[PDB]
Amino acid sequence: IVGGYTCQENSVPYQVSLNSGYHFCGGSLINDQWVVSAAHCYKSRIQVRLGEHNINVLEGNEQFVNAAKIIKHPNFDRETYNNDIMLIKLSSPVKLNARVATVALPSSCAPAGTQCLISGWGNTLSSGVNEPDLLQCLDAPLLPQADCEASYPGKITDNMVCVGFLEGGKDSCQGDSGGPVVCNGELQGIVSWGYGCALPDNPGVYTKVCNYVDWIQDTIAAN
Ligand SMILES: O=C(C1CCN(c2ccncc2)CC1)N1CCN(S(=O)(=O)c2ccc3cc(Cl)ccc3c2)CC1
């Protein structure tokens, strides 16, 4: 997260770290045994880490669980990042508590102008790379699809939504991928892509979660 702030310890209880020897992506706990992330964060073996604040220091609230089933959206296109959503079934259910809690699926698509919360342990620099130890937070609004499409001519699909600032300075970045953008207690987006980090007129684009509520529920039920 570029231009964000350090989240209060365990204030984003649904945030998880996808670890494969190191943190490489984020995700959201949607129920005691399922995590939603980005298809582009796929790996054959993943250890999901919950109750994290400092990813490099044991603080006493962590629960490390291995992924049992990693299911990318069937129509994920690695070239356009369309349908960039993935579901992970944990090998065993986690203990839900204050620092480890679930986030709700969207009941409807949030209107542009809605203020949302983005979080992650991704790169904090607009140029270069700096991986933070502590979970970062960013308060950003959903942008009008018109401004989104205008920023990325021909690249924005109906399954994508821009969140951020047209002036730059604040944005998601590498390592935040798969992470959540929660608006009013509901998961409205998933960190997906951008051509840089925190650049003017180049807001980050996220997977529009409201378009997959059905697929999510179905896949969960059938697995
Ligand atoms: O420009 C790119 C790719 C991004 C993926 N890509 C397309 C091209 C067309 N349509 C969809 C995706 C081709 C160019 N990258 C540079 C930035 N990196 S990144 O710094 O690791 C990154 C990763 C995720 C991000 C997510 C957000 Cl929401 C904002 C910036 C982000 C930046 C990703 C690859």
Ligand SMILES: [Ca+2]
């Ligand atoms: Ca820790």
